[PDB]
Ligand binder design. Structure first.
Ligand SMILES: CC(C)CCNC(=O)Cn1cc(-c2ccc3c(-c4nc5ccccc5[nH]4)n[nH]c3c2)cn1
Length: 203
């Protein structure tokens, strides 16, 4: 593989995905993504690591100065930016994201590192808000924080400053529209000490 085999379009992710580019394999015309790194400053496992809710790494290559990561392109963007569109997601929507995500974590986390496929299906790529108390003093806690933020439009522990305490003491509450099925799953996940609503609502 070489840089010259690819057409480059626009940067895709301006926010520390700011080095991944819309790209296109020259011969087949297939649309792809290209992440570019300067060597001056892993890749082998993610290659034969295939799953529908995980972005493919298709390969890597380098030259005298840089390293290039050939990645699947997710046409519909980040889950993050959909959340900013719709302000919050309906139950049907969040529930299918969650099982998609549990499926991803099973085979193996933030709305901005989450991408959307051709059919709107979620795929994983790769401060405080999504971190468990243990980890600040885990991917199930994260799932809990994500399920809340999908139904609600903000993460459950949002405060003005970083001064931590809300998370460590699990102080969070629900607006009323959030059903007990939703509440139960979330409250089970957001336990300080490290499903019917998920079926029913999903695919
Ligand atoms: C060694 C290995 C672990 C590296 C593989 N991971 C990375 O290179 C980090 N990374 C960036 C991405 C990334 C970021 C954004 C996109 C996108 C994408 N599509 C978009 C469509 C509209 C708006 C934004 C979009 N971003 N597609 N694929 C992506 C892939 C995925 N992984």
């Amino acid at each position: 593989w070489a840089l010259e085999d690819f057409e480059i379009g626009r940067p895709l992710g301006k926010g520390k995905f700011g080095n991944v580019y819309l790209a296109r394999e020259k011969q087949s015309k297939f649309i792809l993504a290209l992440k570019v790194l300067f060597k001056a400053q892993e890749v082998e496992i993610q290659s034969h690591l295939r799953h529908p809710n995980i972005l493919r790494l298709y390969g890597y290559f380098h030259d005298a100065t840089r390293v290039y990561l050939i990645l699947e392109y997710a046409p519909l963007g980040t889950v993050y930016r959909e959340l900013q569109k719709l302000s919050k997601f309906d139950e049907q929507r969040t529930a299918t994201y969650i099982t998609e995500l549990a499926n991803a974590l099973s085979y193996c986390i933030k709305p901005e590192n989450l991408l959307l496929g051709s059919a709107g299906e979620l795929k994983i790529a790769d401060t405080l808000d999504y971190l468990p108390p243990e980890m600040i003093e885990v991917d199930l806690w994260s799932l809990g924080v994500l399920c809340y933020e999908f139904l609600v439009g903000k993460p459950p522990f949002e405060a003005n400053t970083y001064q931590y305490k809300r998370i460590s003491r699990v102080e969070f509450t629900f607006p009323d529209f959030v059903t007990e099925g939703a509440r139960d799953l979330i409250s089970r996940l957001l336990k300080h000490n490290p499903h019917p609503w998920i079926t029913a609502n999903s695919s």
